[PDB]
Design a protein around this ligand. Structure first.
Ligand SMILES: CCCCNC(=O)N1CCC(C)CC1
Ligand SMILES: CCCCNC(=O)N1CCC(C)CC1
Lengths: 193, 193
């Protein structure tokens, strides 16, 4: 039961490395998973649904990693603090490039994909803003822009920059340079006057 | 000749306010423009082509405005300098919200839309980096990150943040707050150590 569902999800992730979801058929997915077509339709209503579940797993992986970090603060300077946090997303999404790509493309066509992305981006922004607020309260960061609006722009920067880097879009920051680039912009904008 | 082409483009821009390109038919476009279907196909091979031409016009409008600014430097502090520049994009894309939305969505499905976007983003990044380099040469900005990589991340931030603001995505910066938010992040990251 969960065996064949997992195999469907694994097949989909493997195939999305090579082609977009549009050029992957339900037959392709069932064949890869060792099942028939109608047995596929037992587990998922559509190939779009498969991509939704893949994206849900990746987003929750990132979220759970960020929670783990928030419970286990590393003992470091504020630069390293933000770097370790940004790195959760760099590593988690960067380990699932094909899902990230296809998920971000689905936002324009799937309400459910858009909603998933929005839910988690709201959470991540809210947490960012709470950390900025804590830095301001302890006197380390100046009271400049509204923390939630600063957090929003920085999170959107990271989304667009990380995803362009992973896809080798032109233009993009090289993947080996993206974490230094983002961390600089976060630290200067959060702590600068 | 150019009358009916222009009418097609105007009809398309008006209809994309209400629905995505997928729910707009070639019949809808021809009807709005006062022409027949086969007369449409004289002027454009497809509705996708119409969106490409709309996006090309908006991108070149922004580009020409930025050139005009680069030839006519305002006499101001460095904050205002970047603000006036960012404002070119805020105003130009913000005056064509429906084209911006539909164009950005087409990037995932149209090679020609992706290429157009890439060409101009490369230009805008290169110009940003040249201005940063000039600020460093005159001693106003510190030599921190590679100027071109900083420019790339800041331009991608602006793309994602402006477009989320215009679309009222959740999450987004309110439109009335986006220019202050971006300018802060640009100034602190360019001039901060
Ligand atoms: C990939 C979209 C979200 C990016 N968010 C992001 O990198 N972080 C959000 C939360 C904090 C603390 C660290 C950095
Ligand atoms: C909308 C995508 C491009 C954003 N680029 C951008 O806002 N600018 C690029 C160029 C400079 C000088 C000002 C600001």
């Amino acid at each position: 039961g969960d065996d064949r569902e997992l195999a469907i999800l694994a097949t989909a992730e493997n195939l999305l490395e090579d082609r977009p979801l549009a050029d992957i058929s339900v037959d392709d997915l069932a064949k890869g998973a060792g099942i028939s077509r109608p047995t596929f339709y037992f587990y998922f209503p559509s190939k779009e649904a498969v991509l939704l579940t893949l994206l849900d797993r990746v987003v929750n992986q990132a979220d759970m990693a960020l929670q783990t970090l928030a419970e286990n603060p590393a003992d470091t300077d504020r630069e390293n603090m933000w770097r370790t946090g940004i790195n959760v997303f760099f590593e988690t999404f960067g380990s699932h490039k094909a899902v990230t790509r296809a998920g971000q493309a689905a936002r324009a066509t799937s309400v459910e994909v858009a909603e998933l992305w929005s839910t988690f981006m709201q959470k991540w922004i809210a947490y960012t803003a709470a950390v900025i607020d804590a830095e301001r309260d302890r006197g380390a960061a100046p009271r400049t822009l509204p923390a939630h609006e600063l957090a929003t722009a920085l999170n959107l920067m990271n989304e667009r920059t990380l995803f362009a880097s992973f896809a080798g879009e032109q233009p993009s920051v090289p993947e080996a340079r993206v974490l230094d680039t983002l961390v600089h912009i976060w630290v200067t904008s959060i702590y600068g006057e």
